[PDB]
Amino acid sequence: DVQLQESGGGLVQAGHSLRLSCVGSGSRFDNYAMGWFRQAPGKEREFVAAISWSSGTTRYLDTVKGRFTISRDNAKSTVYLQMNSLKPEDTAVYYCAARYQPRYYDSGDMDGYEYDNWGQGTQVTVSS
């Protein structure tokens, strides 16, 4: 079980950048596949990006490819979401999530993860 804490949200202009961070504590960070999700107001939570423990495998929502990059630093128990070329439709609370992953995972299983550890979220507002 891992405790997650996001930060780095904010108010930014359309076209600009923000870098989100999420620090984990409790169980070893390098045992977890990490995911970023987001929920806009009055809409349903959606998947944004994910990364394996080893950074060997990433997955992205189609509409964020070539704009957002997921990465991590296991020694700092931290996962990052670098969000470039932000659009008004990127406005949302961004949530960090974790899912236990074996050291020797099948990359196929990266598509079917139900994430069971969640942070409280960081607010991102993009204006224009």
Added chain:
Amino acid sequence: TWSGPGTTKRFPETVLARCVKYTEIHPEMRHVDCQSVWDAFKGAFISKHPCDITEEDYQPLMKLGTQTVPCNKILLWSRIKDLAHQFTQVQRDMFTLEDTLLGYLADDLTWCGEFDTSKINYQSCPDWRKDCSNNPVSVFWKTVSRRFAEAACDVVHVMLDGSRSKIFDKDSTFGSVEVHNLQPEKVQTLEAWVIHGSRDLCQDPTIKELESIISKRNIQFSCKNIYRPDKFLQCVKNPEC
């Protein structure tokens, strides 16, 4: 007919799929061409008498499978495979030999070929004790474990089984190969983790023999009891116990 079991069913397919899986997991190894790795592996022992294999036969494989492991994160083990791999399953910045690409590809498999043909021998393979020690499997493990031990630096760790009649055994891979291939330049200290299955075991006669070997090679020796293995793995998983 040899005395040992034949090559593992689906050896080629199993090695190739292990290579694909490992190189997907590890971004530093995604350059590796898994077909070439297999060709090099197969080239070490195909069309060869399986009592005539040498470290040279495996050189092309070592070149393709070479890997930089952080030299201060190495875990050696002797007769306690189970718990060693459970440890590195959690403590993922650390590597046993079977956590390296080449070690991962070969773990729990047997293989050999034959002099007459280009075919894999699925019928039988030489047993190291009853047939010959220079067989494809033993020579593979001797080569990769020497290189792994030569790569180590700073504090090297070794897990040992405290429930055995000889906690340290001179006649094991650890006791006859790895221990003589740690380099005094690179390696300051060998730290033994004695796993209990309870009183301090670091004065056991065999541990004193290990200490003697290590000291004679100008490396420092240190010994620690793991009195309760469960608690140990739990505490590595969540340090905040």
